[PDB]
């Protein structure tokens, strides 16, 4: 998962 | 100066991830999650230039006024530079093997720093064909923010999700020091106080706090509490004795830089706040912030 994706 | 906040120009757009003021033209650059970038004249409220740079998010963008450029970095891993007077794409290169979070431009030397999810900061020299001149290794999670010390730009700070700020010297491979922030959700942003009377830096975190640091002693001077979701940024205003922060709670907060008490909370109505810029020369005490649904340029007084 990509954290801080937004 | 009395806080007398006026809306100079606000416009809606896709989510604004990066923002910057031009130092001599009344322009703001916005970089969007959609891959688009826009340059607006906020006095005439007319678009100067806009570019569909990529289809991926563009999280970072800065003017390089002395070369008539913008420089942008995106989730496709690439740095791109455009001449804002002609539209020419000056350079387009893969900078990292992962997302670019932050770009900083040296105030006098032809250096750009990029911070990345690849755990590094990289230094690029535009007088040497944009060569990679150094990679700064040591962080253990995404590097979210890079900033030169304006009073000694031979050094710079990196803020990281590994819960530290590292301060480095150009040309040296290890940090001059690592700051343990106690911000256990990581550091999203780091900024320097610009004036010579205090050796201060400021950090913002998903743990809802903003912390002010003396970078000579490493002590925490103050912790600013009040935001209700991730704090995307916190900066010292270059002319006024205030700190400005913004959050995924949808607010901007202005804090007294001497007492560290909140002075104003603004909900400008654009949902989550992501990015900030301050006009360097203090022209009209302008600030600009980017949000989920657009941007606003405010005159603070």
GROMACS .gro file of C-alpha atoms in nm:
model
  307
    1UNK     CA    1   0.000   0.000   0.000
    2UNK     CA    2   0.107   0.357  -0.075
    3UNK     CA    3   0.085   0.572   0.236
    4UNK     CA    4  -0.004   0.937   0.168
    5UNK     CA    5  -0.155   0.836  -0.164
    6UNK     CA    6  -0.399   1.129  -0.169
    7UNK     CA    7   0.031   4.511   1.109
    8UNK     CA    8  -0.320   4.410   1.214
    9UNK     CA    9  -0.453   4.082   1.075
   10UNK     CA   10  -0.707   4.204   0.815
   11UNK     CA   11  -0.748   3.901   0.591
   12UNK     CA   12  -0.884   3.965   0.243
   13UNK     CA   13  -0.945   3.718  -0.039
   14UNK     CA   14  -0.739   3.831  -0.338
   15UNK     CA   15  -0.831   3.545  -0.571
   16UNK     CA   16  -0.971   3.194  -0.529
   17UNK     CA   17  -1.058   2.952  -0.807
   18UNK     CA   18  -1.174   2.593  -0.815
   19UNK     CA   19  -0.978   2.307  -0.971
   20UNK     CA   20  -0.879   1.949  -0.911
   21UNK     CA   21  -0.680   1.889  -0.595
   22UNK     CA   22  -0.385   2.125  -0.558
   23UNK     CA   23  -0.076   1.943  -0.425
   24UNK     CA   24   0.193   2.205  -0.488
   25UNK     CA   25   0.188   2.584  -0.495
   26UNK     CA   26   0.441   2.864  -0.532
   27UNK     CA   27   0.457   3.243  -0.583
   28UNK     CA   28   0.664   3.414  -0.849
   29UNK     CA   29   0.889   3.672  -0.677
   30UNK     CA   30   0.839   3.962  -0.923
   31UNK     CA   31   0.528   3.884  -1.131
   32UNK     CA   32   0.187   3.864  -0.955
   33UNK     CA   33   0.165   3.495  -1.039
   34UNK     CA   34   0.090   3.173  -0.852
   35UNK     CA   35   0.176   2.824  -0.980
   36UNK     CA   36  -0.049   2.535  -0.883
   37UNK     CA   37   0.032   2.168  -0.946
   38UNK     CA   38  -0.262   1.928  -0.947
   39UNK     CA   39  -0.337   1.567  -0.863
   40UNK     CA   40  -0.468   1.531  -1.220
   41UNK     CA   41  -0.127   1.596  -1.377
   42UNK     CA   42  -0.216   1.951  -1.480
   43UNK     CA   43  -0.026   2.262  -1.373
   44UNK     CA   44  -0.158   2.619  -1.389
   45UNK     CA   45   0.002   2.963  -1.362
   46UNK     CA   46  -0.247   3.234  -1.262
   47UNK     CA   47  -0.210   3.610  -1.249
   48UNK     CA   48  -0.395   3.664  -0.922
   49UNK     CA   49  -0.426   4.041  -0.973
   50UNK     CA   50  -0.598   4.021  -1.315
   51UNK     CA   51  -0.750   3.675  -1.244
   52UNK     CA   52  -0.637   3.547  -1.585
   53UNK     CA   53  -0.446   3.229  -1.658
   54UNK     CA   54  -0.089   3.294  -1.776
   55UNK     CA   55  -0.014   2.939  -1.894
   56UNK     CA   56  -0.130   2.586  -1.817
   57UNK     CA   57   0.008   2.246  -1.912
   58UNK     CA   58  -0.121   1.890  -1.897
   59UNK     CA   59   0.218   1.763  -1.783
   60UNK     CA   60   0.131   1.399  -1.712
   61UNK     CA   61  -0.164   1.186  -1.607
   62UNK     CA   62  -0.014   1.122  -1.265
   63UNK     CA   63  -0.021   1.356  -0.964
   64UNK     CA   64   0.222   1.646  -0.970
   65UNK     CA   65   0.303   1.693  -0.599
   66UNK     CA   66   0.581   1.949  -0.629
   67UNK     CA   67   0.631   2.268  -0.825
   68UNK     CA   68   0.847   2.576  -0.791
   69UNK     CA   69   0.938   2.879  -0.997
   70UNK     CA   70   1.301   2.931  -1.092
   71UNK     CA   71   1.253   3.297  -1.179
   72UNK     CA   72   1.615   3.372  -1.268
   73UNK     CA   73   1.587   3.119  -1.555
   74UNK     CA   74   1.220   3.190  -1.643
   75UNK     CA   75   1.133   2.830  -1.555
   76UNK     CA   76   0.893   2.621  -1.355
   77UNK     CA   77   1.018   2.288  -1.223
   78UNK     CA   78   0.770   2.013  -1.138
   79UNK     CA   79   0.789   1.660  -1.001
   80UNK     CA   80   0.530   1.387  -1.036
   81UNK     CA   81   0.427   1.036  -0.933
   82UNK     CA   82   0.554   0.901  -1.266
   83UNK     CA   83   0.896   0.956  -1.104
   84UNK     CA   84   0.995   1.240  -1.338
   85UNK     CA   85   1.123   1.594  -1.299
   86UNK     CA   86   1.020   1.830  -1.579
   87UNK     CA   87   1.123   2.189  -1.639
   88UNK     CA   88   0.929   2.432  -1.859
   89UNK     CA   89   1.002   2.784  -1.975
   90UNK     CA   90   0.694   2.979  -1.868
   91UNK     CA   91   0.739   3.242  -2.142
   92UNK     CA   92   0.761   3.000  -2.435
   93UNK     CA   93   0.619   2.672  -2.307
   94UNK     CA   94   0.938   2.488  -2.405
   95UNK     CA   95   1.005   2.168  -2.212
   96UNK     CA   96   1.366   2.230  -2.112
   97UNK     CA   97   1.431   1.888  -1.957
   98UNK     CA   98   1.235   1.574  -1.867
   99UNK     CA   99   1.412   1.300  -1.670
  100UNK     CA  100   1.344   1.016  -1.431
  101UNK     CA  101   1.472   1.146  -1.096
  102UNK     CA  102   1.381   0.860  -0.860
  103UNK     CA  103   1.228   0.511  -0.886
  104UNK     CA  104   0.931   0.628  -0.677
  105UNK     CA  105   0.707   0.927  -0.612
  106UNK     CA  106   0.858   1.276  -0.583
  107UNK     CA  107   0.719   1.454  -0.277
  108UNK     CA  108   0.907   1.782  -0.259
  109UNK     CA  109   1.136   2.008  -0.461
  110UNK     CA  110   1.351   2.292  -0.327
  111UNK     CA  111   1.555   2.546  -0.527
  112UNK     CA  112   1.875   2.695  -0.393
  113UNK     CA  113   1.850   3.075  -0.361
  114UNK     CA  114   2.169   3.155  -0.557
  115UNK     CA  115   2.339   2.837  -0.681
  116UNK     CA  116   2.201   2.624  -0.968
  117UNK     CA  117   2.088   2.344  -0.740
  118UNK     CA  118   1.756   2.167  -0.699
  119UNK     CA  119   1.678   1.912  -0.429
  120UNK     CA  120   1.414   1.642  -0.474
  121UNK     CA  121   1.281   1.428  -0.188
  122UNK     CA  122   1.123   1.094  -0.269
  123UNK     CA  123   0.946   0.784  -0.144
  124UNK     CA  124   1.268   0.605  -0.246
  125UNK     CA  125   1.406   0.717   0.096
  126UNK     CA  126   1.651   0.972  -0.053
  127UNK     CA  127   1.712   1.335  -0.133
  128UNK     CA  128   1.885   1.402  -0.463
  129UNK     CA  129   2.076   1.712  -0.571
  130UNK     CA  130   2.065   1.818  -0.939
  131UNK     CA  131   2.277   2.093  -1.100
  132UNK     CA  132   2.119   2.272  -1.395
  133UNK     CA  133   2.450   2.425  -1.506
  134UNK     CA  134   2.584   2.069  -1.548
  135UNK     CA  135   2.306   1.940  -1.776
  136UNK     CA  136   2.086   1.856  -1.474
  137UNK     CA  137   2.343   1.603  -1.355
  138UNK     CA  138   2.285   1.410  -1.035
  139UNK     CA  139   2.556   1.555  -0.811
  140UNK     CA  140   2.473   1.383  -0.481
  141UNK     CA  141   2.230   1.141  -0.322
  142UNK     CA  142   2.164   1.185   0.050
  143UNK     CA  143   2.093   0.845   0.208
  144UNK     CA  144   1.995   0.770   0.565
  145UNK     CA  145   1.621   0.816   0.600
  146UNK     CA  146   1.413   0.502   0.650
  147UNK     CA  147   1.072   0.608   0.509
  148UNK     CA  148   0.931   0.850   0.252
  149UNK     CA  149   1.104   1.188   0.237
  150UNK     CA  150   0.810   1.429   0.241
  151UNK     CA  151   0.973   1.772   0.241
  152UNK     CA  152   1.307   1.934   0.165
  153UNK     CA  153   1.404   2.291   0.246
  154UNK     CA  154   1.726   2.489   0.231
  155UNK     CA  155   1.828   2.693   0.533
  156UNK     CA  156   1.785   3.045   0.387
  157UNK     CA  157   2.051   3.182   0.623
  158UNK     CA  158   2.301   2.910   0.529
  159UNK     CA  159   2.191   2.735   0.212
  160UNK     CA  160   2.497   2.513   0.217
  161UNK     CA  161   2.271   2.315   0.453
  162UNK     CA  162   1.917   2.189   0.414
  163UNK     CA  163   1.658   1.992   0.608
  164UNK     CA  164   1.461   1.686   0.510
  165UNK     CA  165   1.140   1.582   0.686
  166UNK     CA  166   1.050   1.216   0.675
  167UNK     CA  167   0.778   0.966   0.767
  168UNK     CA  168   1.053   0.790   0.970
  169UNK     CA  169   0.972   1.053   1.237
  170UNK     CA  170   1.295   1.250   1.192
  171UNK     CA  171   1.429   1.566   1.036
  172UNK     CA  172   1.783   1.536   0.904
  173UNK     CA  173   1.999   1.845   0.841
  174UNK     CA  174   2.273   1.796   0.584
  175UNK     CA  175   2.566   1.981   0.431
  176UNK     CA  176   2.607   1.985   0.056
  177UNK     CA  177   2.903   1.770  -0.034
  178UNK     CA  178   2.884   1.554   0.283
  179UNK     CA  179   2.721   1.213   0.298
  180UNK     CA  180   2.583   1.193   0.653
  181UNK     CA  181   2.353   1.432   0.839
  182UNK     CA  182   2.506   1.705   1.048
  183UNK     CA  183   2.235   1.592   1.290
  184UNK     CA  184   1.911   1.396   1.308
  185UNK     CA  185   1.624   1.548   1.503
  186UNK     CA  186   1.399   1.300   1.684
  187UNK     CA  187   1.070   1.485   1.668
  188UNK     CA  188   0.851   1.267   1.885
  189UNK     CA  189   0.593   1.301   1.606
  190UNK     CA  190   0.531   0.930   1.590
  191UNK     CA  191   0.312   0.940   1.275
  192UNK     CA  192   0.603   1.100   1.083
  193UNK     CA  193   0.701   1.444   0.957
  194UNK     CA  194   0.511   1.578   0.655
  195UNK     CA  195   0.672   1.922   0.636
  196UNK     CA  196   0.973   2.117   0.760
  197UNK     CA  197   1.042   2.491   0.725
  198UNK     CA  198   1.297   2.740   0.854
  199UNK     CA  199   1.236   3.069   1.028
  200UNK     CA  200   1.396   3.319   0.788
  201UNK     CA  201   1.534   3.591   1.013
  202UNK     CA  202   1.868   3.584   1.197
  203UNK     CA  203   1.736   3.634   1.550
  204UNK     CA  204   1.620   3.271   1.607
  205UNK     CA  205   1.768   2.939   1.486
  206UNK     CA  206   1.424   2.786   1.448
  207UNK     CA  207   1.267   2.517   1.234
  208UNK     CA  208   0.908   2.393   1.235
  209UNK     CA  209   0.761   2.048   1.165
  210UNK     CA  210   0.407   1.928   1.091
  211UNK     CA  211   0.271   1.575   1.140
  212UNK     CA  212  -0.017   1.336   1.091
  213UNK     CA  213  -0.010   1.313   1.474
  214UNK     CA  214  -0.199   1.646   1.471
  215UNK     CA  215   0.093   1.852   1.609
  216UNK     CA  216   0.322   2.128   1.490
  217UNK     CA  217   0.655   2.161   1.670
  218UNK     CA  218   0.906   2.447   1.679
  219UNK     CA  219   1.273   2.351   1.721
  220UNK     CA  220   1.595   2.530   1.810
  221UNK     CA  221   1.830   2.367   1.560
  222UNK     CA  222   2.139   2.458   1.761
  223UNK     CA  223   2.032   2.277   2.081
  224UNK     CA  224   1.774   2.038   1.919
  225UNK     CA  225   1.521   2.133   2.186
  226UNK     CA  226   1.150   2.161   2.121
  227UNK     CA  227   1.057   2.522   2.191
  228UNK     CA  228   0.682   2.472   2.154
  229UNK     CA  229   0.410   2.232   2.039
  230UNK     CA  230   0.107   2.384   1.864
  231UNK     CA  231  -0.210   2.179   1.908
  232UNK     CA  232  -0.553   2.234   1.761
  233UNK     CA  233  -0.578   2.078   1.418
  234UNK     CA  234  -0.815   1.779   1.400
  235UNK     CA  235  -0.661   1.584   1.114
  236UNK     CA  236  -0.322   1.544   0.945
  237UNK     CA  237  -0.123   1.868   0.939
  238UNK     CA  238  -0.002   1.908   0.580
  239UNK     CA  239   0.230   2.205   0.640
  240UNK     CA  240   0.334   2.474   0.884
  241UNK     CA  241   0.551   2.772   0.795
  242UNK     CA  242   0.683   3.095   0.939
  243UNK     CA  243   0.560   3.398   0.751
  244UNK     CA  244   0.859   3.589   0.608
  245UNK     CA  245   0.749   3.932   0.729
  246UNK     CA  246   0.472   3.897   0.990
  247UNK     CA  247   0.519   3.747   1.339
  248UNK     CA  248   0.290   3.452   1.266
  249UNK     CA  249   0.296   3.085   1.171
  250UNK     CA  250   0.052   2.952   0.911
  251UNK     CA  251  -0.058   2.587   0.905
  252UNK     CA  252  -0.307   2.383   0.705
  253UNK     CA  253  -0.471   2.048   0.753
  254UNK     CA  254  -0.685   1.770   0.614
  255UNK     CA  255  -0.939   1.907   0.862
  256UNK     CA  256  -1.004   2.173   0.596
  257UNK     CA  257  -0.867   2.468   0.793
  258UNK     CA  258  -0.585   2.715   0.777
  259UNK     CA  259  -0.466   2.830   1.118
  260UNK     CA  260  -0.266   3.143   1.195
  261UNK     CA  261  -0.068   3.132   1.518
  262UNK     CA  262   0.116   3.404   1.708
  263UNK     CA  263   0.486   3.327   1.662
  264UNK     CA  264   0.575   3.464   2.007
  265UNK     CA  265   0.307   3.314   2.232
  266UNK     CA  266   0.227   3.017   2.004
  267UNK     CA  267  -0.146   3.069   2.056
  268UNK     CA  268  -0.389   3.035   1.767
  269UNK     CA  269  -0.507   3.374   1.641
  270UNK     CA  270  -0.737   3.277   1.354
  271UNK     CA  271  -0.892   2.963   1.206
  272UNK     CA  272  -1.019   2.987   0.848
  273UNK     CA  273  -1.233   2.737   0.662
  274UNK     CA  274  -1.214   2.869   0.305
  275UNK     CA  275  -1.458   2.603   0.186
  276UNK     CA  276  -1.231   2.396  -0.040
  277UNK     CA  277  -1.206   2.080   0.177
  278UNK     CA  278  -0.865   1.939   0.270
  279UNK     CA  279  -0.561   2.168   0.267
  280UNK     CA  280  -0.239   2.030   0.114
  281UNK     CA  281   0.017   2.303   0.040
  282UNK     CA  282   0.126   2.659   0.112
  283UNK     CA  283   0.330   2.943  -0.030
  284UNK     CA  284   0.419   3.287   0.105
  285UNK     CA  285   0.520   3.578  -0.112
  286UNK     CA  286   0.894   3.612  -0.041
  287UNK     CA  287   0.913   3.992  -0.044
  288UNK     CA  288   0.598   4.023   0.167
  289UNK     CA  289   0.410   4.193  -0.117
  290UNK     CA  290   0.068   4.267   0.046
  291UNK     CA  291   0.151   3.991   0.296
  292UNK     CA  292   0.021   3.744   0.039
  293UNK     CA  293  -0.015   3.372   0.115
  294UNK     CA  294  -0.159   3.100  -0.106
  295UNK     CA  295  -0.284   2.754  -0.021
  296UNK     CA  296  -0.394   2.457  -0.229
  297UNK     CA  297  -0.683   2.228  -0.140
  298UNK     CA  298  -0.894   1.937  -0.264
  299UNK     CA  299  -1.118   2.172  -0.462
  300UNK     CA  300  -0.890   2.457  -0.568
  301UNK     CA  301  -0.668   2.730  -0.430
  302UNK     CA  302  -0.691   3.064  -0.259
  303UNK     CA  303  -0.461   3.367  -0.250
  304UNK     CA  304  -0.510   3.581   0.061
  305UNK     CA  305  -0.368   3.914   0.168
  306UNK     CA  306  -0.319   3.896   0.545
  307UNK     CA  307  -0.316   4.272   0.606
   0.00000   0.00000   0.00000
